[PDB]
Amino acid sequence: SALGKLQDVVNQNAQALNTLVKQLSSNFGAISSVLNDILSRLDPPEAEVQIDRLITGRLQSLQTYVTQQLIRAAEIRASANLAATKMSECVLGQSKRVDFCGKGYHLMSFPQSAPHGVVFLHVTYVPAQEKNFTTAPAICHDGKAHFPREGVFVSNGTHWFVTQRNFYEPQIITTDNTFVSGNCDVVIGIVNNTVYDP
């Protein structure tokens, strides 16, 4: 059931073909549905009208079939454009669009050939085993604000550490990964701490 869309497309095409073939069984008001039988049983005067009615019916059926086929072809063109976009943006690179190639942080993709389709193997990065911590916007050591360049100030209960956003990796809060901007009475949520200077 993985290739459900491909199976549905194949089934729709098969049903359309079968209906187009079966539409030759109706007379559309004529005496019979067999053109050869009509031509062999009727005179040209009435045969002209019978052929006209059969032609009208079959032409209407074929026009309906062609319209449905054009609609399905437009849908398949849209799907193929989406597939080519996903290929160019995930197989030939690393997409940053959310929920575009796999549910999670996109890493890479592998294309796989399929009958009248394509299968992508989206490799994602899903975080797990999350732990609760106490966070703070900034800290003040010597009367000046201290904001982390890249990271979040977390505390395990007694000591504050700066770690990554998608992976817990605590580090000592130093002046290398922390800059100064402003004072300690303009930020709401300041926490008195000590910044280490190497």
Partner: protein, 167 residues
């Protein structure tokens, strides 16, 4: 004027010269009696749609029937917004939607193996402990490779009219 319908009473006031009547869609909904002067009302006969909710035949042969746009009085019983389903039971639980009926009602074949009718659940009831000094930093990860299938093309067919219409 012939036809079929439920000849009930009405409340509209026909003018003395007016005999027949129509509606917004130019449909006859009220006429006058030829003998008396009573104002009737041509209400259409009761009709609707029938939908058969059934699981796979390999599993079982028990089926249900849904009458669309009825009021459970035109035909074990369930009054829904889509219609009146006769053949299933209304349970108080909530599962995933197996057979979409309509207006949230969903049907599934569960155990006492019969057909039930419940309301689809939108998912689990989770609550994040939001606070001004609380953060959840992940400590591990898991690489998950998913699959995504998209059609690229179809069968290239060609129908010759000079052979299909005229053989």
């Amino acid at each position: 004027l012939t036809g079929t319908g439920v000849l009930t009473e009405s409340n509209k006031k026909f003018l003395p010269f007016q005999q027949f009547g129509r509606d917004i869609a130019d449909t006859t909904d009220a006429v006058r009696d030829p003998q008396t002067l009573e104002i009737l009302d041509i209400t259409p006969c009761s009709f609707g749609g029938v939908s058969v909710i059934t699981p796979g035949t390999n599993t079982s042969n028990q089926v249900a029937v849904l009458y669309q746009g009825v009021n459970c009085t035109e035909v074990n019983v369930f009054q829904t917004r889509a219609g009146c389903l006769i053949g299933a039971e209304h349970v108080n639980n909530s599962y995933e939607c197996d057979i979409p009926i309509g207006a949230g009602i969903c049907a599934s074949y569960q155990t006492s193996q019969s057909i039930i009718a419940y309301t689809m659940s939108l998912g689990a009831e989770n609550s994040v402990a939001y606070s001004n000094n609380s953060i959840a930093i992940p400590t591990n990860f898991t690489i998950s490779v998913t699959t995504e299938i998209l059609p690229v093309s179809m069968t290239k067919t060609s129908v010759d009219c000079t052979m299909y219409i005229c053989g």
